[PDB]
């Protein structure tokens, strides 16, 4: 019981931290932000939460990028070597 309570308290903290990134309104509410960089150019970032916090806006701009660099992980199972 004590361990379950501790784990539930940890999960509650994680949920609270996640809630900070979610919008109060629904997905299709709308709202576009235009963040201008110092060299007189503005990039458009969507989402309600990006309007108030700049870090979230930059993070979402980062995630929107599609291209991913390669990562090759050649691993051999133990059964291969018996």
């Amino acid at each position: 019981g004590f361990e379950l309570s501790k784990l539930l308290q940890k999960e509650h903290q994680m949920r609270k931290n996640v809630i900070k990134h979610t919008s109060a309104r629904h997905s299709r509410f709308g709202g576009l932000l235009s963040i201008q960089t110092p060299d007189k150019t503005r990039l458009t970032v969507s989402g309600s939460q990006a309007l108030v916090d700049e870090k979230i806006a930059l993070q979402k701009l980062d995630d929107s990028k599609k291209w991913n660099k390669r990562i090759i992980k050649k691993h051999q199972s133990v059964a291969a070597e018996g």
Partner: protein, 137 residues
């Protein structure tokens, strides 16, 4: 220092947030009466009190996440005259900013007042504003 700006316009979001926070922090209903040419109807108890502070405190005591707003109240104040037009013309961004500012105001009220209220309930609650009386029908 990148500057956040609403798309297609020239309104700084930080200006909106600070103006709305100031309006909520210090607003007395006497301004609303003054605006409507009802100066002689001003009392000394209800009109000399921080309206939205009592609204937010009642919200907290009753455990609610809703604050009904009147646009004519925004027009009454001095710093939020342009905020009325911004709300009318760009409702989505202004509404989101107002919701976040309301949540921040509640958190700041709890922290500064040194109350024993646990921060968990307020932190995980979504707060929404519901403006009405926004002009002619």
């Amino acid at each position: 220092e990148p500057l956040r700006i609403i798309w297609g316009t020239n309104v700084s979001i930080q200006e909106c947030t600070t103006n709305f926070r100031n309006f909520l922090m210090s607003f007395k209903y006497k301004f609303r009466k003054i605006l409507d040419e009802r100066e002689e109807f001003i009392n000394n108890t209800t009109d000399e009190e921080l309206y939205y502070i009592k609204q937010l405190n009642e919200m907290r005591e009753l455990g609610t996440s809703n604050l009904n707003l009147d646009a004519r109240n925004l027009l009454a104040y001095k710093q939020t005259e342009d905020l009325y037009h911004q709300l009318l013309n760009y409702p989505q961004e202004v509404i989101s900013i107002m919701d976040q500012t309301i949540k921040d105001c509640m958190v700041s009220l709890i922290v500064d007042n040194n109350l024993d209220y646990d921060l968990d309930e307020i932190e995980t609650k979504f707060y929404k504003v519901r403006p009405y009386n926004v002009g002619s029908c």
